[PDB]
Amino acid sequence: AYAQEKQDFVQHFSQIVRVLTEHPEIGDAIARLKEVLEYNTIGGKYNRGLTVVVAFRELVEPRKQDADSLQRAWTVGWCVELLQAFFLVADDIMDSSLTRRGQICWYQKPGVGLDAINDANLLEACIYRLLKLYCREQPYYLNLIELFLQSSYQTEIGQTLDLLTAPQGNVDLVRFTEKRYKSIVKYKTAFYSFYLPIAAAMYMAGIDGEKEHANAKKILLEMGEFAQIQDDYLDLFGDPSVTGKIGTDIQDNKCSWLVVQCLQRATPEQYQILKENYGQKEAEKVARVKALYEELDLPAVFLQYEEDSYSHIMALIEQYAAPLPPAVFLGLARKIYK
Amino acid sequence: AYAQEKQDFVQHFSQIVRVLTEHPEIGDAIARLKEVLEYNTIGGKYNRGLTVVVAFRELVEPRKQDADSLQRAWTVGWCVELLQAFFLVADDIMDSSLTRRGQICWYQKPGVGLDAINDANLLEACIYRLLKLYCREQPYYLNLIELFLQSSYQTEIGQTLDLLTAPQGNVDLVRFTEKRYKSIVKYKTAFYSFYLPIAAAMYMAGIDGEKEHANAKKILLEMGEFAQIQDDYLDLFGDPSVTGKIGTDIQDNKCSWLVVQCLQRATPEQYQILKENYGQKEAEKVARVKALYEELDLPAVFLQYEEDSYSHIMALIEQYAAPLPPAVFLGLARKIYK
Numbered sequence A, B: 001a002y003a004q005e006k007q008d009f010v011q012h013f014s015q016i017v018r019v020l021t022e023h024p025e026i027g028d029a030i031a032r033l034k035e036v037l038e039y040n041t042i043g044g045k046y047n048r049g050l051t052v053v054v055a056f057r058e059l060v061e062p063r064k065q066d067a068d069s070l071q072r073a074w075t076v077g078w079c080v081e082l083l084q085a086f087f088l089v090a091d092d093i094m095d096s097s098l099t100r101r102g103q104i105c106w107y108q109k110p111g112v113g114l115d116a117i118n119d120a121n122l123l124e125a126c127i128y129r130l131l132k133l134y135c136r137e138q139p140y141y142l143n144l145i146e147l148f149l150q151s152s153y154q155t156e157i158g159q160t161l162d163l164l165t166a167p168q169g170n171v172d173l174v175r176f177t178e179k180r181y182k183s184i185v186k187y188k189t190a191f192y193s194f195y196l197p198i199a200a201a202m203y204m205a206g207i208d209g210e211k212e213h214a215n216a217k218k219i220l221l222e223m224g225e226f227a228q229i230q231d232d233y234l235d236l237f238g239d240p241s242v243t244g245k246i247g248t249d250i251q252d253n254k255c256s257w258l259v260v261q262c263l264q265r266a267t268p269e270q271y272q273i274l275k276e277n278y279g280q281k282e283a284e285k286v287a288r289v290k291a292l293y294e295e296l297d298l299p300a301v302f303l304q305y306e307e308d309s310y311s312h313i314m315a316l317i318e319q320y321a322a323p324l325p326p327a328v329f330l331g332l333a334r335k336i337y338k
């Protein structure tokens, strides 16, 4: 389980920071990297990184879980957390967000600003530094490099689809379709958040078969679709004290699950209300959209969807888990379905 | 030679774009990637990419230069041009630049803005897409992946040093030292612009020895230091019709070679003039700094430096080229020393 390993995982971060921040000439730049790592890779729930560690423990025979192999698993879990930190620092600039993980976004900090672009790229570079230091002699080293590089390309293509569908200052209700939505979230979130951590543990355990990885992907990309729908729902209806951040999807004209569901149910009067108020900074326009979503009972539509989704994901675990332990996927379902 | 291969190299770009932009769901995002590739990876001199191709031709026996091997060399040269495009798109946002390669910077284009952050990352992702498609079965594949990843980390650490030394709105004359300068440019420019293209050709030719790569690096990082000093000089004294871009180093408070040389020669009255006018947006303050640099004959100091640098780099070619053909380094010296 995760809940137990959260403190244990977090305890390994100080060694990750020490190995990355140990040529005195670059000293000031290494001090800045330490500040970027400390600010941006801590404060989250660490679900993606913990997934690597728990899945590795469940997939590798305990007699093979020696100290060095376990250290490699913790390090690769932290690599997944560094990839997410890279995407979030940059996403927060592109989405004009204000807070993340209970504090001001890194780019909004006085003295940081758009220098955060380079800081995000340093976080991504740290992944490959750690893989070389800890994993270069292992038979799965190239599989992991390619998996992290593919996950980044996937995510970036999905970010392009997200940003193209959400132009600033242009109405884009015509592209807020279920088909467009499923394509955005599959690429921007599902691959790196669900497939990547389990696939990394699979490769570290010697499970490199195409069929085995395709079957796990069938479960995991559907779980990732639900995780992004829940993120969209919480952007507006979650409590920032719990989520750690303030939502921006309506002001940012995003193809959110909520707006997709709104358009499917709206009358022509409601469609016009959404056209006139969506995608704009004015607080009273944002409030009108939320009031429309409440008039259409979209919170009840989301709860029903969550139930139907959970049943679908469990049916996929029954179809596709074997020969992996079903616990690998059940523990991940427990973290996302609250 | 380069001058001949410029059109031949450019002719391969259409196949690079076709293989990268060939799942209809992501179609709109792939169309945007094609626009980012067309806008940002064309218009330059292609010196870094051509260096890969010319060095490969000079290092590999002609009987081994079959069509497929030559295609791999063109593709890896284009990978170096994609790395430079990634760094330049992001650098232009962080340096608040206006033009590049004779047109408005990508981020300044109406409708692009900070979405250019994700576009820059897509350019970097394309490198690894091409290396996998064209080079995965080759014995040097992992050497090239690691070389591109190291070059990126080097460059990003140097960008951190550049940005830290150049705070907006704070005087930083105390850190504009020759020692700080040499450290910034070695990491931000010399590794990716000079070592990377020659080292990539070396690995493709089977030259993977640590000693051979260290000796080439001794020449190439010094040539890269001169290339950044020339870039700094041209930021203020070059003609934008020739350089393709407008300089921003004085307004951006940069640790430019020019300001370093100014501080070494300044009287106390001149130091105060530079303190009051450097690092600020006002056009009349920028003009005062340029007038001070002219009073101190910094253009003549740069020409003398260029002569002394060229003699030093040629002495290093005599010391360290062997057993590589000296032409590999002489052709690169000819491109940078005008």
Ligand SMILES: O=P(O)(O)C(O)(Cc1cccnc1)P(=O)(O)O
Pocket: A087, A088, A091, A095, A097, A155, A159, A188, A189, A231, A235
């Ligand atoms: O955490 P956020 O900003 O709600 C988000 O989930 C962050 C994110 C960044 C990159 C890829 N996927 C999700 P978004 O998609 O912007 O709603």
Ligand SMILES: O=P(O)(O)C(O)(Cc1cccnc1)P(=O)(O)O
Pocket: B087, B088, B091, B095, B097, B155, B159, B188, B189, B231, B235
């Ligand atoms: O082309 P530019 O902007 O003059 C530059 O050379 C671009 C650049 C970007 C990244 C690394 N090195 C040089 P800079 O260093 O900003 O002066």
Ligand SMILES: [Mg+2]
Pocket: A091, A092, A095, A097
């Ligand atoms: Mg966001």
Ligand SMILES: [Mg+2]
Pocket: A091, A095, A162
């Ligand atoms: Mg986003």
Ligand SMILES: [Mg+2]
Pocket: A231, A232, A235
């Ligand atoms: Mg969100």
Ligand SMILES: [Mg+2]
Pocket: B091, B092, B095, B097
């Ligand atoms: Mg610049």
Ligand SMILES: [Mg+2]
Pocket: B091, B095, B162
């Ligand atoms: Mg710069």
Ligand SMILES: [Mg+2]
Pocket: B231, B232, B235
């Ligand atoms: Mg410059």
